[PDB]
């Protein structure tokens, strides 16, 4: 948790409903945006902060919280976009007799700033003496070790927690239907909204350009961004009646 791993996620397409519906995660509640509607919103860069804590302080992974972990290992801002995924890892992160690789900042000089990294294992100064790099009275090691057993209580078990923080490229999935031919549809291709019937065409589009156009510019032809075939667009049958 003190060497919390941060991954930049940029220039891709992110899927968030697969994380929401997996049901393998014990705590999944989101601040700033609902988990359903953060798939149709999107951002510039996505930060994934992964660590392993004890499960009894998972309330400390929240905006504006107090405790050892929130103030000395990983601090959240109050204006936090993104949220927290928490799930048990007792069959992997906990070993019989104690898995002690995971450490946390028990002592520090002050509280953290939001998103601050601390790796320094310099000897702490509880009192007043030159500790000079060695351990002794009031000169403690600032990191305390997690004790993980497979026989302990459920909140006193190792929990994997990954926090996603938001801030424009990283935008999610997109699909609705099939393509619909010879019927009046009010289509939406990449953002261009038009109404008309889509037909098989003979217009040999060159491989780079996307959609057609004519004299007195109207988007009369389109290639789909989907399967790459060519579709005429005809206006939807608008004649007057007498």
């Amino acid at each position, epitope marked *: 948790v003190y060497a919390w791993n941060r991954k930049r996620i940029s220039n891709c397409v992110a899927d968030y409903s697969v994380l929401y519906n997996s049901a393998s995660f014990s705590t999944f509640k989101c601040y700033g945006v609902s988990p359903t509607k953060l798939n149709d919103l999107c951002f510039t860069n996505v930060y994934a902060d992964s660590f392993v804590i004890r499960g009894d302080e998972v309330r400390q992974i929240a905006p504006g919280q107090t405790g050892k972990i929130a103030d000395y290992n990983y601090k959240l801002p109050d204006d936090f976009t993104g949220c927290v995924i928490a799930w048990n890892s007792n069959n992997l992160d906990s070993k019989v007799g104690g898995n002690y690789n995971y450490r946390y900042r*028990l*002592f520090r000089k*002050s509280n953290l700033k939001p998103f601050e990294r601390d790796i320094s294992t310099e000897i702490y100064q509880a009192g007043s003496k030159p500790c000079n790099g060695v351990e002794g009275f009031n000169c403690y090691f600032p990191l305390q070790s997690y004790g993980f057993q497979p026989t302990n209580g459920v909140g006193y078990q190792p929990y994997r927690v990954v926090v996603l923080s938001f801030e424009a490229t990283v935008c999610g999935p997109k699909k609705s239907t099939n393509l619909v031919k010879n019927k009046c549809v009010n289509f939406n291709f990449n953002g261009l909204t038009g109404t008309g019937v889509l037909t098989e065409s003979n217009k040999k589009f060159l491989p780079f350009q996307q959609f057609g156009r004519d004299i007195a510019d109207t988007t009369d032809a389109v290639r789909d961004p989907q399967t790459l075939e060519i579709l005429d667009i005809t206006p939807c049958s608008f004649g007057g009646v007498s």
Partner: antibody
Amino acid sequence: EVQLVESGGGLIQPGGSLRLSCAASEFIVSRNYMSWVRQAPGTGLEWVSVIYPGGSTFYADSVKGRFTISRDNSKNTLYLQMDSLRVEDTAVYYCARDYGDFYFDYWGQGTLVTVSS
Amino acid sequence: EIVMTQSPVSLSVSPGERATLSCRASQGVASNLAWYQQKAGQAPRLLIYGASTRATGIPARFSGSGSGTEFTLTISTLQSEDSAVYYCQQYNDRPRTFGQGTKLEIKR
């Protein structure tokens, strides 16, 4: 020199208010982890409150809302203001330096408060 | 919370008999126990931390161990300065509850 010398005890009415102090020696009150503990006869030694570097004030569920702690940063002193004292609050109060929230490293001499009619 | 109970609440033991003190923890803690000694009008020192380690200057007389629901402190040769109050305290549950005290004296 490790010293934790305490003051503020005395006889008060049930329903009165008083104020404690714990002068510390050679270490910082506002930057170390310490705790207020009580001992009464017949009952065991009991944790009341704990206070962090800056941090948060953590109380017992029995005394939550009644006691308050306000450390004063002019010197190495730790206070506790006692309001709405019940009849069961006859105890000697100790300021004890902790190793975070694990174990009591050092203790004071305690100041004993007796509340009665 | 863990409410502490000392079963040998008062034990009068000859000057050197390897006396046995104990407590039970009403909940399940693995080895989360520390043993304390309060002398007469003095500061209550720690004796044992983690239920298996002697902290600082704690001799080989003290062989306290135990787990889960039964914890036992062993005092070996019993100088008269060990006639004191023996506490046992857990690490796991907030709020922290001390032991009720074991009154050990040496018969003269």
